[PDB]
Design a protein around this ligand. Structure first.
Ligand SMILES: Nc1ncnc2c1ncn2[C@@H]1O[C@H](COP(=O)(O)OP(=O)(O)O)[C@@H](O)[C@H]1O
Ligand SMILES: Nc1ncnc2c1ncn2[C@@H]1O[C@H](COP(=O)(O)OP(=O)(O)O)[C@@H](O)[C@H]1O
Ligand SMILES: [Cl-]
Ligand SMILES: [Mg+2]
Ligand SMILES: [Mg+2]
Ligand SMILES: [Mg+2]
Ligand SMILES: [Mg+2]
Lengths: 105, 456, 456, 105
């Protein structure tokens, strides 16, 4: 069987990092779960890009923050916060695609 | 009377627009009358109460340019009911100024009749005490306080005021609040065509091509009245009149399709037939009219407070599933923080995607993957409405609901600023019949419009 | 010499509120500083650009009354960053007047420092030409035109201006736009406490109880800095700090949790640790601060047009299924009817219940049973935005979509009027670093507030 | 034999009849089908009331308009058009419960 991200994470969320960037934070329930996800090499830009309907090179960084058993995904907002046509000025409700993630482990 | 009378209705409400080609083709059919409804009570009480149009000035001016140029060029009267959306004095003056501008831009000169429908409060007060007011179905009993606290009060005129203006030679007739069929029916009736058939034809034409199929609120229709019935047609190959589309518009917005009441009588449709004819046209016959003691319907609205609102989406399934309780907890939190002890503050939520349209009557009890959360606060002052709306917004944004995993914020706002001050809120206060009297007579005034303004 | 420094953060943004009991319990801990963030760029560019608050005046006043009464009564400094939501000159003045009113009502006298953050356009023009401007990640290169067309331009101050005001004896420090951790860290740093610990503590405290769990934008938090770390606590038995909640707020709103840049240096968090201690508290250690050449972040916005919007639901499954094509056809109709010819007229739809929140990134491709249709038009003038929005609204209301059976109208509006004019629209225009210079030095000025005002 | 109303009706819709009343119009493609529905006596106030979550007595009238092969259902509006708290000022999107109707012939 596969392990869902939801079963492993305490926090799965989005927010702006300034008007030009969207960050996704995942904080894991335990260090062991964080290390097994990190070791698996399954949380890739290709995976995130496909979930968000963006090209992999649109994902700017995936940062593995060891002190907090956390991963931060950073991508460019394709609509600057507050620009005409925006959907989410604060960048606060863009996390849902991450909820479908399952790890093959 | 003799042979036929052709009525062109260009659009459902003046200002909604229409294809230029449809209007051109309609004019090639040589109408005897260009008539249009310019207003309605459907958009709600704000427009009458605040004296504002629900239609667009540029749209109204655009549509009227076509109509007035055509009417004046071909010696066809142009008749408009419920000028300016609601047909009170400010709505009538608003449309009158548009027409002056058209005459100055197109270098036209014509006579224009104005027919106000405003009713002074003293007349309504006196009629109430004299037993001459009757509430319509489900309408509360009228009170003196309701009269006094209303703003503009208007009466829906019938065919007779239009006829007097037309008989005096008016080339354009700009009526205040009016019974919709009367705009269309007044002229053919004074020329000898049957009152029942003319009023029924006016009813089906009242929204132009909404009576055709596929419908459009922005396309032309014509009724051709003869001595045995009337024929209905559109001027767009994409649209047709059918027995269903024409009968649908007999039913449209009425509480009994057999009996349509208005000022001076009731249309009795028990003996009607709708019959497809030609290609894409319908012939209607058998309509009749029963005169009744003459009474007028009054409309009025009153101010009830001020509104501030915000809109924002949520995409989180935990928040969505728990949303009803979250909103209750947010309201409790705000009441405590601002020490709100006012029963006159009203907070309303619309949860689009679950029950925003039907409320308690929505049969589906579960939302999908997304909600649009619309919040509005109505309070006695704009400042209070703003304060409550702002605190609900920021409290909901960061509310720590049970099992939350998306912990940086709960709401996707489309706009900066997130809060929108929408201003005064009105509610209907008068929707009642009044027995006709000399004091309620609608009198016309004709002015001569020229390219340089009104000329004495 | 004190071995600990206690910082009370009352609420996430000044004005968001907090339980009176939480603040009372926090004061019992005898803080050495009451500090709060009053502003943010997250609410979007309207607030800086138009000079307006995203918080509520009554809410800000309610919150400040607790804080200033407590600070003056206990000889505890009160430090506020990004006064008035955005921290430009009008926002600073707005918050300043609120404080004067509190002093009058509470019969208090105290010294207050004002630290403006406004930057004259000439300084930014000169810095651009001199090569002293750097764009942050993904920000467009700055141009002279963008500088000239912005309104208020502000620089985010660091600890140093706060420290100078505090050293001068100010009991209340009201700063303009400011780096959020600096509000909290300035005082302990000048008292000898570790820069890294103090700034990291300020970062975790920047939103008060958003760093606790369950979180709240409207609840209090305290950080206690000692010689080896800092401890975080809440004051609500329903909330607590955990290792995850405190670390999450280290990540909150940042592009790289290992390196948090600000004016004068970078917080290097590679060595940080989070340790649950006692009951519902967390001890944080290992934070390091590394100096960098001093630069300030500038913020600025420019007006791009004017907006009018409408909101309405649809409940019909045929309309919902075909909505995307319907909206394209409605826009085409309106453009032809109004003879539209300006690419600057932008019509935006949000279909709540389908893709209102995520747009083209929404993974779910099918709506449910209901949509909330939010439409907004941004145009070069308010009159054009109002006119296009009105025609889109009435055209969509009566559009004859394929296979339609609900033929009397397509939209459920919650409001009268249906259209809401929302006014000028701004977009960010400056989000760039500028090298420090004498001309960019922040000045403070102290005034003596009394119940009668500020003399002279 | 179960037969859906949707398969028989050309029009199924709501609109205000003034600010105080909501009307539901059902127009049939054929007189044959209209008469079969009418004579079946299955389109009752009880049926409609249950579909809309109202008491049977809330339904004011059901009017069988033979010249149009149409039936009109009349109810008061429980929120006057434009009142604070309204959901549908024009009364234009209140028809959906009727779409579930099935007759037994
Ligand atoms: N004199 C009257 N007597 C009775 N009912 C009237 C009278 N005048 C108006 N009404 C009522 O008001 C309605 C007005 O409809 P209409 O003129 O089509 O207005 P709208 O512009 O709002 O569509 C009529 O259908 C009828 O119910
Ligand atoms: N001097 C600076 N050098 C580099 N980046 C800066 C500087 N000042 C501000 N920033 C950036 O701007 C952000 C401002 O964050 P913060 O002060 O918390 O603002 P907000 O009030 O918008 O929450 C920082 O996290 C950083 O990304
Ligand atoms: Cl303008
Ligand atoms: Mg009308
Ligand atoms: Mg009408
Ligand atoms: Mg801030
Ligand atoms: Mg911040």
């Amino acid at each position: 069987m596969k392990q869902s991200l939801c079963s492993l994470a305490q926090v799965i969320r989005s927010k702006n990092a300034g008007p030009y960037e969207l960050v996704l934070d995942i904080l894991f329930k335990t260090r062991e779960d964080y290390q097994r996800v990190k070791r698996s090499e399954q949380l890739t830009p290709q995976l995130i890009a496909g979930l968000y309907n963006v090209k992999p090179d649109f994902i700017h960084r995936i940062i593995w923050f060891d002190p907090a058993n956390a991963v931060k995904i950073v991508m460019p907002r394709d609509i600057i916060s507050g620009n005409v046509g925006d959907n989410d000025v604060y960048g606060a409700q863009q996390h849902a695609p991450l909820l479908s993630i399952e790890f093959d482990f | 009377m003799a042979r036929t009378f052709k009525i062109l209705s260009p659009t459902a409400i003046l200002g909604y627009g229409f294809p230029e080609e449809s209007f051109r083709k309609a004019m090639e059919a040589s109408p005897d009358l260009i008539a249009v409804d310019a207003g309605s009570s459907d958009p709600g009480p704000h427009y009458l109460g605040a004296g504002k149009p629900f239609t667009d000035r540029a749209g109204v001016k655009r549509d009227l340019r076509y109509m007035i140029v055509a009417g004046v060029k071909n010696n066809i009267p142009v008749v408009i009911g419920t000028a300016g959306g609601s047909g009170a004095a400010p709505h009538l003056e608003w449309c009158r100024q548009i027409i002056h501008e058209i005459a100055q831009e197109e270098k036209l000169s014509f006579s224009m009749a104005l027919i106000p429908s405003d009713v002074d409060k003293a007349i309504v007060h006196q009629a109430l005490d004299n037993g001459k007011i009757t509430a319509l179905d489900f309408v509360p009993e009228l009170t003196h306080e309701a009269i006094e606290e209303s703003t503009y009060i208007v009466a829906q005129m019938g065919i007779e005021p239009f006829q007097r203006a037309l008989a005096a030679g008016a080339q354009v007739v700009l009526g205040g609040r009016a019974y919709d069929p009367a705009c269309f029916a007044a002229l053919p009736i004074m020329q000898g065509f049957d009152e029942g058939l003319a009023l029924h034809c006016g009813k089906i034409l009242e929204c132009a091509a909404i009576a055709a199929t596929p419908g459009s609120g922005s396309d032309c229709a014509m009724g051709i009245i003869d001595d045995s019935g009337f024929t209905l047609k559109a001027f767009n190959p994409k649209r047709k009149f059918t027995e269903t589309s024409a009968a649908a518009h007999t039913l449209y917005e009425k509480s009994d399709p057999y009996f349509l009441p208005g000022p001076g009588g009731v249309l009795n449709l028990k003996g009607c037939t709708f019959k497809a004819v030609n290609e894409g046209e319908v012939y209607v016959s058998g309509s009749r009219h029963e005169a009744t003691p003459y009474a007028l319907k009054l409309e009025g609205a009153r101010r009830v407070g001020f509104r501030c609102l915000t809109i924002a989406g949520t995409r989180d399934p935990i928040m969505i599933a728990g949303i009803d309780n979250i909103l209750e907890e947010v309201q409790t939190s705000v009441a405590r923080n601002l020490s709100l002890n006012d029963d006159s503050i009203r907070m309303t939520f619309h949860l689009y995607g679950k029950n925003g349209v039907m409320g308690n009557h929505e049969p589906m009890k579960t939302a999908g993957h997304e909600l649009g959360i619309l919040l509005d606060v109505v309070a006695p002052t704009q400042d209070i409405a703003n304060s409550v709306c702002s605190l609900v917004r920021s409290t909901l944004l960061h509310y720590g609901y049970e099992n939350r995993i998306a912990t940086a914020g709960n709401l996707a706002f489309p706009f900066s600023p997130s809060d929108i001050q929408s201003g005064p809120v009105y509610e209907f206060s008068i929707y009642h019949l009044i027995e006709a009297s000399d004091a309620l007579r609608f009198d016309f005034h004709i002015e001569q419009v020229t390219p340089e303004g009104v000329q004495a």
